[PDB]
Amino acid sequence: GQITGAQIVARALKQQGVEYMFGIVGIPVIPIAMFAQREGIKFYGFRNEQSASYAAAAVGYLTGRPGVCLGVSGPGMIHGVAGMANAWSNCWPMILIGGANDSYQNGQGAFQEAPQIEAARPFAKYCARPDSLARLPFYVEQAVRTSIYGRPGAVYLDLPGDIITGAMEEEDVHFPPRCPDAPRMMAPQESIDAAMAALKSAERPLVIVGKGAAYSRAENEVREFLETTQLPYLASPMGKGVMPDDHPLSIAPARSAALLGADVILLMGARLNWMMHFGHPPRFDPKVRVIQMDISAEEIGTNVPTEVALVGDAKAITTQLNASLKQQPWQYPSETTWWTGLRKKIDENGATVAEMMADESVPMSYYRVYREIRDLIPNDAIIQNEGASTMDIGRTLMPNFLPRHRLDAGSFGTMGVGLGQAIAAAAVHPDKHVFCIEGDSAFGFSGMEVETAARYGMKNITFIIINNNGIGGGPDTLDPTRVPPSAYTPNAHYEKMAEIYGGKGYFVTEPSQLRPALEEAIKADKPAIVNIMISATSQRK
Amino acid sequence: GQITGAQIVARALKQQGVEYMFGIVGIPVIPIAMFAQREGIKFYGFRNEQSASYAAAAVGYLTGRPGVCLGVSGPGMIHGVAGMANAWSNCWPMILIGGANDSYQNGQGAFQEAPQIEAARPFAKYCARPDSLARLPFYVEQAVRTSIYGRPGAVYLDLPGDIITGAMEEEDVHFPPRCPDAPRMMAPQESIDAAMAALKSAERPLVIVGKGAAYSRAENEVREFLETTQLPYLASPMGKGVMPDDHPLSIAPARSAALLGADVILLMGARLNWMMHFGHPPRFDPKVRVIQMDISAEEIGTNVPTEVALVGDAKAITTQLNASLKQQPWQYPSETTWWTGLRKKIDENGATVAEMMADESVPMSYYRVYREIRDLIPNDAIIQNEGASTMDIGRTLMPNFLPRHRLDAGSFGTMGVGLGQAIAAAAVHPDKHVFCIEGDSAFGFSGMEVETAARYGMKNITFIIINNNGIGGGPDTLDPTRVPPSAYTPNAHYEKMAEIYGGKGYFVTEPSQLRPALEEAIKADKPAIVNIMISATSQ
Amino acid sequence: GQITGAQIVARALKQQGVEYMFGIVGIPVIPIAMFAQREGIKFYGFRNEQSASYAAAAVGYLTGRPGVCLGVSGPGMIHGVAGMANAWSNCWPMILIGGANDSYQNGQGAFQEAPQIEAARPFAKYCARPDSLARLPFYVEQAVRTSIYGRPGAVYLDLPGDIITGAMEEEDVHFPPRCPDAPRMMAPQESIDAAMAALKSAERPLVIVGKGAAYSRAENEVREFLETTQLPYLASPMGKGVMPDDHPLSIAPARSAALLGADVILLMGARLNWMMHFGHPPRFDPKVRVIQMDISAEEIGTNVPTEVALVGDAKAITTQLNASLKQQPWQYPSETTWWTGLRKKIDENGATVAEMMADESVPMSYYRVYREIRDLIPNDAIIQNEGASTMDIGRTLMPNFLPRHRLDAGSFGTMGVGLGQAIAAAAVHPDKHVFCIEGDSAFGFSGMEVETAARYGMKNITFIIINNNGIGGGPDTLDPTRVPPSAYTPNAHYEKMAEIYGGKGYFVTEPSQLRPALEEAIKADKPAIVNIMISATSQRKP
Numbered sequence A: 001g002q003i004t005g006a007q008i009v010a011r012a013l014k015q016q017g018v019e020y021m022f023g024i025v026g027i028p029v030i031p032i033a034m035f036a037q038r039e040g041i042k043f044y045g046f047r048n049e050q051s052a053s054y055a056a057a058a059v060g061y062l063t064g065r066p067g068v069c070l071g072v073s074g075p076g077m078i079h080g081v082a083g084m085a086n087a088w089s090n091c092w093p094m095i096l097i098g099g100a101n102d103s104y105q106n107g108q109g110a111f112q113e114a115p116q117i118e119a120a121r122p123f124a125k126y127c128a129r130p131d132s133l134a135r136l137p138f139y140v141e142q143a144v145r146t147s148i149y150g151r152p153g154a155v156y157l158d159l160p161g162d163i164i165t166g167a168m169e170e171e172d173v174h175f176p177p178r179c180p181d182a183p184r185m186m187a188p189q190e191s192i193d194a195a196m197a198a199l200k201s202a203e204r205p206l207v208i209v210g211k212g213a214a215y216s217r218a219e220n221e222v223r224e225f226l227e228t229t230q231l232p233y234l235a236s237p238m239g240k241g242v243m244p245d246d247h248p249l250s251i252a253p254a255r256s257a258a259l260l261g262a263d264v265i266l267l268m269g270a271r272l273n274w275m276m277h278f279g280h281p282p283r284f285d286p287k288v289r290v291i292q293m294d295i296s297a298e299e300i301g302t303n304v305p306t307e308v309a310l311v312g313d314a315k316a317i318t319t320q321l322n323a324s325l326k327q328q329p330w331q332y333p334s335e336t337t338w339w340t341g342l343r344k345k346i347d348e349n350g351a352t353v354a355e356m357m358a359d360e361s362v363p364m365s366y367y368r369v370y371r372e373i374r375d376l377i378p379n380d381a382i383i384q385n386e387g388a389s390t391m392d393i394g395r396t397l398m399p400n401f402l403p404r405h406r407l408d409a410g411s412f413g414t415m416g417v418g419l420g421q422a423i424a425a426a427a428v429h430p431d432k433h434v435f436c437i438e439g440d441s442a443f444g445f446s447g448m449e450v451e452t453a454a455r456y457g458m459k460n461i462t463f464i465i466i467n468n469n470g471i472g473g474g475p476d477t478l479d480p481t482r483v484p485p486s487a488y489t490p491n492a493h494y495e496k497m498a499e500i501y502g503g504k505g506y507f508v509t510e511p512s513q514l515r516p517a518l519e520e521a522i523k524a525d526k527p528a529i530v531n532i533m534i535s536a537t538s539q540r541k
Numbered sequence B: 001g002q003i004t005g006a007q008i009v010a011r012a013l014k015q016q017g018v019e020y021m022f023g024i025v026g027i028p029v030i031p032i033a034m035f036a037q038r039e040g041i042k043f044y045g046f047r048n049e050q051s052a053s054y055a056a057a058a059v060g061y062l063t064g065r066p067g068v069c070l071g072v073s074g075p076g077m078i079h080g081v082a083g084m085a086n087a088w089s090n091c092w093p094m095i096l097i098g099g100a101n102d103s104y105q106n107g108q109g110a111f112q113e114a115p116q117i118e119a120a121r122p123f124a125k126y127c128a129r130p131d132s133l134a135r136l137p138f139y140v141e142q143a144v145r146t147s148i149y150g151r152p153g154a155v156y157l158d159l160p161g162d163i164i165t166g167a168m169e170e171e172d173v174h175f176p177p178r179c180p181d182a183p184r185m186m187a188p189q190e191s192i193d194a195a196m197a198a199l200k201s202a203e204r205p206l207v208i209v210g211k212g213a214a215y216s217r218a219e220n221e222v223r224e225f226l227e228t229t230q231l232p233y234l235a236s237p238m239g240k241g242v243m244p245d246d247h248p249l250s251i252a253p254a255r256s257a258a259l260l261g262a263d264v265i266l267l268m269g270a271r272l273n274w275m276m277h278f279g280h281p282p283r284f285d286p287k288v289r290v291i292q293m294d295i296s297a298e299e300i301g302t303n304v305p306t307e308v309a310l311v312g313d314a315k316a317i318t319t320q321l322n323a324s325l326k327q328q329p330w331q332y333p334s335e336t337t338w339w340t341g342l343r344k345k346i347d348e349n350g351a352t353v354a355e356m357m358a359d360e361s362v363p364m365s366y367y368r369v370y371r372e373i374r375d376l377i378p379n380d381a382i383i384q385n386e387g388a389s390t391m392d393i394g395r396t397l398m399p400n401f402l403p404r405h406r407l408d409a410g411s412f413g414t415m416g417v418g419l420g421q422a423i424a425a426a427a428v429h430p431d432k433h434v435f436c437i438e439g440d441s442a443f444g445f446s447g448m449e450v451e452t453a454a455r456y457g458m459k460n461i462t463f464i465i466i467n468n469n470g471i472g473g474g475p476d477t478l479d480p481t482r483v484p485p486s487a488y489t490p491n492a493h494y495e496k497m498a499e500i501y502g503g504k505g506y507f508v509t510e511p512s513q514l515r516p517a518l519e520e521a522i523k524a525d526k527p528a529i530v531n532i533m534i535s536a537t538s539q
Numbered sequence C: 001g002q003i004t005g006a007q008i009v010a011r012a013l014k015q016q017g018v019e020y021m022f023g024i025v026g027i028p029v030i031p032i033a034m035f036a037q038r039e040g041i042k043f044y045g046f047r048n049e050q051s052a053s054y055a056a057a058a059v060g061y062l063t064g065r066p067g068v069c070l071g072v073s074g075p076g077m078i079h080g081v082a083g084m085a086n087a088w089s090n091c092w093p094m095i096l097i098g099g100a101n102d103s104y105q106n107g108q109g110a111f112q113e114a115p116q117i118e119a120a121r122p123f124a125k126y127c128a129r130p131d132s133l134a135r136l137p138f139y140v141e142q143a144v145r146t147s148i149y150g151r152p153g154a155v156y157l158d159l160p161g162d163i164i165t166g167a168m169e170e171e172d173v174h175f176p177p178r179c180p181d182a183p184r185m186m187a188p189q190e191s192i193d194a195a196m197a198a199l200k201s202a203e204r205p206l207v208i209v210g211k212g213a214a215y216s217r218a219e220n221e222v223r224e225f226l227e228t229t230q231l232p233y234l235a236s237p238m239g240k241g242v243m244p245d246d247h248p249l250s251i252a253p254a255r256s257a258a259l260l261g262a263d264v265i266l267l268m269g270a271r272l273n274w275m276m277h278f279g280h281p282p283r284f285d286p287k288v289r290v291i292q293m294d295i296s297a298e299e300i301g302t303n304v305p306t307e308v309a310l311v312g313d314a315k316a317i318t319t320q321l322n323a324s325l326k327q328q329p330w331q332y333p334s335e336t337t338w339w340t341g342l343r344k345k346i347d348e349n350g351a352t353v354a355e356m357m358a359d360e361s362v363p364m365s366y367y368r369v370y371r372e373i374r375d376l377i378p379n380d381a382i383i384q385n386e387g388a389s390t391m392d393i394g395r396t397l398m399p400n401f402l403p404r405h406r407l408d409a410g411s412f413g414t415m416g417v418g419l420g421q422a423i424a425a426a427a428v429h430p431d432k433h434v435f436c437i438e439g440d441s442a443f444g445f446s447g448m449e450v451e452t453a454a455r456y457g458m459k460n461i462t463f464i465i466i467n468n469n470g471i472g473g474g475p476d477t478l479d480p481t482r483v484p485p486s487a488y489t490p491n492a493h494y495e496k497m498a499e500i501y502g503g504k505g506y507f508v509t510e511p512s513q514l515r516p517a518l519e520e521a522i523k524a525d526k527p528a529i530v531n532i533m534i535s536a537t538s539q540r541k542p
Ligand SMILES: Nc1ncnc2c1ncn2[C@@H]1O[C@H](COP(=O)(O)OP(=O)(O)O)[C@@H](O)[C@H]1O
Pocket: A090, A091, A151, A152, A209, A210, A211, A212, A213, A215, A216, A236, A237, A238, A239, A269, A270, A271, A273, A275, A293, A294, A295, A296, A299, A312, A313, A314, A315, A411
């Protein structure tokens, strides 16, 4: 009856709701990975901790419980800090478990001795180095609860080697119960009535449904709220799917005109950050009334004054708004100058998009490639879209129908999360298909992770590379003594990386090769790579 | 006419609700204090930034909007981080405005150049170095709003000298409006009913009223709650006053008894920290069920599992409880085996208290001295108690009837907040009398600030020193080569410091002098000091 | 036999050369202060850890081994970060020992649980929380060694409660030997001959003697080099005493003219920071050639380029400059246009200084008061001068004849170091007298420490308060509502604080009261206070 620290941590994580663990083993975190599998936690051995830390953050967004990134002492943990910042920026729960040198070797210049707690502090809600084996379950339970309660964030546990490998009696350790699900605070009664009056007194109302509404699991109530009020709504890049992107109330093609003309905006789990242009002119009405629904009280009132503050959980507050529509029913009129003005902009944009999508010139364009892509993604798949032009075009091109089904660079604009987040999507959804659509540069960050996807049999992932030979484009030839900083090797056969694990690679340059190569890639028994070449001068609209 | 960065900061502070500023002037924050008085902010020049930063955190607890501590670059700002940590520990809104060297001198070894941002960060919710003059009102509103929203805390603004001395067109500076009061969060209706179920099913219930409820300013709602349900309640040291200490529902004389045998406990703005012994045995039921009411979601479930999590503002949640109680009337029975057990200990403990306050022996004891102080403090006064035994015995002997009328060491257990919090209490309540009962050791931390109190005419403050010649006691004689590390000068006449500003000092050794000296000091036109000698053996 | 962690760290501190400890006791650092006295370390209980941490940094400058500031967990340690920063700014060795809650209570909201390592690190060369009891001497030896080797600085030791109270058999504890003194590296012969060739070519040379040369204890070698070369030298505020302030080679009364007209400058343990105007115009020649002698290689070349870099110990490199002169003797001539120019400004500034001292009017001025103070201070006493004008006017008027005999605000310009530094001076030098000349504003930062000085029988300290009723002056009548932010109580009786411990206070307001009150305060058997009133509108020599 002797239990080790790695055993205690592994069982504690499984008890507190951890199911997926990513990272790379080594001194001294080897036992933690072995016991994680022996306790019911799937461990995925990545090729670089940077990509593994991004996968851990994506699990916190998809499942509601934090994903664990395991890194060795010193540099292994430091690589994982990149993911901590991403979870810090996107408000996602995630745990970074970093090994450390033997505590009795501190100050001696031990192997991989580093100020790991201080390196994780700027992006962590919680840092801790446990003091004893018997109190390890206290730190794990506190680490999980801190990551999901309130505004979700990243936490870090510093595990010295002697605690990982030390042993003690099992009857003496105490395992706390699985901490309850994150409490859902509600808005005050008087504020819900004030939020309705502002919406009922709006000439040009607008609803913004963002990442916070998707993470809050509030898809049912938002669809009930919008369909009952018939309000025009705008989805964030990762709010797509909370409300179906083919819904009539969506004004996404007229995004710029809606934000510029709106006088009362309802924020549903979204922030007025760089993505929303800080809510300031010339993109917004300088006197726009703002109703903000957010779980963080400090976020309320950022950049733009907030007239009605709905501090609390997006799912708990939206039920109050739905409860307001029962003792006081109200619908927004279906024919106003605001509706007809917007609906003209959508039909104009959609005509321009289709006119650009139907162009078949070679070298191909984004819209031409995204036509064959869009018509082959099933309505229940998971889109992973990383890149610059590729990601932005696909945002408006590829629709989503279920919540939390699109993953991109997020609020931090991080390159390198792509293949990492795609593996996390296949670990959470092993029966659904994941489309990891990448640019040539973004794929180069975590490109070696294609072998990881195949080693765990994640054939539900199809890697699609939109290549234009550089960051925003590159030439057809390169002078080795005069390479542009953004240029890459022209016509780089990235798809030949599929031969590492015996998979299929496709090199597409003409619209005829597009659909057949894509069709056979999805049917493959191993993760296939489709490398599509486009024009370097191809741009947006 | 043009406006300077110092004048921009002062007006923006006043607009966002700042009314009190403490600190010491100097390079380069001198113009800030000048426009502070000019824009209507009461500035108080302290003797040390350490005591000033504690007065700032006290104003945040008393008013609901953060007091400001103004410190010079380098050493001045670093001294103010103490109060930042105190507000960080007590969840109080507080602002430290530390000057900096001119930005065009960074890296040159400028005057008082220091990593001030990194020094404040471990205790700050928000550190910011404003980038330009036009955006100064943006950072000021963001600092105040971040200090009072959510769980209150301390923030820090790094103001370089050139930002302070620079000027620009006044009409080109945009001042955001006064940010609204801290938004109230409410608990789900199912959580209210589950808390009522646990309280109704409780064999031995207990309500712990903490200072989080006092800061929430829910005294009117907590009294409607407890008076309706007749639940026995225990108030934290700074939770006193939310309910009058003479209320029959109080079980404070038997604190160690109720915490030991309470099957269901209701935490009303109270934290299960070291004060509550972590909610663990031997002082707690190993299976105690907790109904936790706190605004910080991360705090819920700490140390002890929380069955009913009432996350949100204490005033809004208590209002839900009262609304539920008047639609579903329930009262804890007045005759219970639980009521008859605590009441016996309350009567038994109260008997030993009376037999200790009747002690007339010289040197005196804590209980004899506090008996006369208790008889002379009105019901509307404010008590500031600091020390160890002096403060703990004063917690159980001083009665508080209005909320937020007692200021002690706080959740940090800080020695040095005494005179700072007393000065803050006198500036917020110039109409009430402020009692500052200090230990001789605690008085050494900030006793120089009696001049600050006298300089601003704060004759409503009475400094009472309870002197046992050291930290928990001191010997009668001292040899300089054999001074105990906890001993001070025997019979140190601290009251002589009242003669610095021409005040009255009093030296009491026998109970015959207690009442006359205390009554004479309250009537003094200048802040008087009463130095009371007590026995080093009394416990 | 079993030994506790408190006794392990107390013995290890004494073994590593720690002699003085300042702080305030309380949970959980009580056994440390008790066991320190049992092991030979002298503990001084202050009234505030802030003043104690300033006293601990002063011990490092006076002795070369770090003084220790002892603080309780949480707020006790945070108060002691001020001294860490002051030692960090002045490059002095200093150790802050802060308590911490029991390790088995982390994350529980324990009593005074705080992120103390992070609070100290911005000013720390070394932060460490010892992992076990048997390795406590390892962390003590490394902390001392780090604080004194290379560029000296402040270190921090984080001691949890159960590390202090735990015990184990004394045999298993390895006590490392007393770490050797700081090594004294030196410059190449090429750099030595180049620096000597630079001085030999200077039309208008100037030598700057900073407290880095004082800390290095190179007073004999500096006096041997300067008296051989006859080079005009300027002494920084705490660089005074390395050379006798009454030296014909001193051009301090003409500091502005010397720094401007100089074309070659030798930096002896002094930085080109705010105190030296960054070596920039209009106070310096734009084409000034600089020879910099500094222990820190990273400091070489700051603001102004360094033609000749002499990286190493000031005492070791000055020895090389003397060996080079013993083989190639060279003297700067004493009748140059550079000399006669500086002396013309010196004689005229000295006349204006002598005139302001002759003023007998009431209220008195800084010069009349210092005229009497200067004449009652022995040539081997220690000067603690803190304030604004009080500190700056005193530096020109208070001559120091021995190195490391003046303590002021330092490179950080700190208010609150005064009384703490005076107590540390008296503890190091109980034979010499300590004069603590303070401004009325500066005195209030740590005024309660007068009782600490009396409690330990420090009769060799005399507290002198130059009172102008505010920060740089103040009115003579105060309305309690309309209070200037820089003014204090008019005619405050700070001398009454001496009566706390039975001492004697003196309230001086006339010139005929200075000498009788000052002469009797020095001879008191308890530390006395002399509160001297001056004019609020009193300035310095323009
Ligand atoms: N369960 C929840 N209920 C309400 N708000 C939440 C919840 N979880 C996160 N949020 C808030 O949602 C916000 C995230 O918005 P953001 O991701 O920037 O919008 P976008 O979708 O445009 O990226 C955060 O400020 C966070 O506080």
